[PDB]
Symmetry: C2
Subunit: 174 residues, 2 copies
């Protein structure tokens, strides 16, 4: 029942609340998967678990009723922290051209595994994560960093297909 | 792997538009269909759902799900439908009348009571009286389009019902 692989992971990251009104729960633990299991099950939390952090130095879970996109919360850097966001609270559909898409789909329309943004293999490119802050060019996720009409896309792991659009549905289009 | 899919018992999908690709294979169990779908290895499309035929032991992998235009869900006792959660809208439009995701926890963090239970709470919100509205399992639902969005009867005997905390699509 190790559920940790089902969260979207951000290395070296925790979340801080600006709004002192927002609520946390913390517990000293052994391993990150223990935090994940309690979040998934939502056992003994007085709120809906949308994200958790494992502190590897203090061996603690921090469970949150918010995520990195909620208002009144900001990211904080820390070598000891990993952030895990519950995919049920990361919008999985696209608004407009999907400039703001932060979901984890990482396969193209024709079923090709996306190439990591941090990689120049197979395809050399200049969509370096550091050139596109805010656009979450992480792992091999489908993204639309320049807001082009095609919707989110990725460079492709197939050497013969440089890039392809991914097949992510519009949230609302009647 | 199978737990990142929403399961609909006794259900298959029929494509109307014959241009939509399908892939099928004789297999042993539904778990193997899920694995192939999750990792998406030998599929010329994005696997958004699959059906397991328990009688023929066949996987049917689809680049669509039940909310896709051009497909009909149908009863069939030998089929189970499994829909990839990444393709079931996880945010709410309007009051969330059309919410079909798998969130089953209230805003205060209480596990929902199954719709087909009368314990702790008795109610007239049974599955058949609201066909089309997916009062399945213990999922947060908004069958009548009420103000606060999807909700459920609560497993806490002290709390009859409570809204869940499903975000508006316009929230972010």
């Amino acid at each position: 029942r190790n559920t940790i692989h089902e969260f979207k992971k951000s290395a070296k990251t925790t979340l801080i609340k600006i709004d002192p009104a927002l609520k946390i729960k913390t517990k000293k633990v052994n391993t990150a998967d223990q935090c994940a299991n309690r979040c998934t099950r939502n056992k003994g939390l007085p709120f809906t678990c949308k994200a958790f952090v494992f502190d590897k130095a203090r061996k603690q879970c921090l469970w949150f009723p918010f995520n990195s996109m909620s208002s009144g919360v900001k990211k904080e850097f820390g070598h000891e922290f990993d952030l895990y966001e519950n995919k049920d609270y990361i919008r999985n559909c696209i608004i407009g051209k999907g400039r703001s898409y932060k979901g984890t789909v990482s396969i193209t329309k024709s079923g090709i595994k996306c190439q990591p943004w941090s990689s120049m293999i197979p395809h050399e490119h200049s969509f370096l994560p550091s050139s596109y802050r805010g656009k979450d060019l992480q792992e091999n996720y489908c993204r639309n960093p320049r807001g082009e009409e095609g919707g989110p896309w990725c460079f492709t792991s197939n050497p013969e297909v440089r890039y392809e659009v991914c097949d992510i549905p519009q949230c609302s289009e009647v």
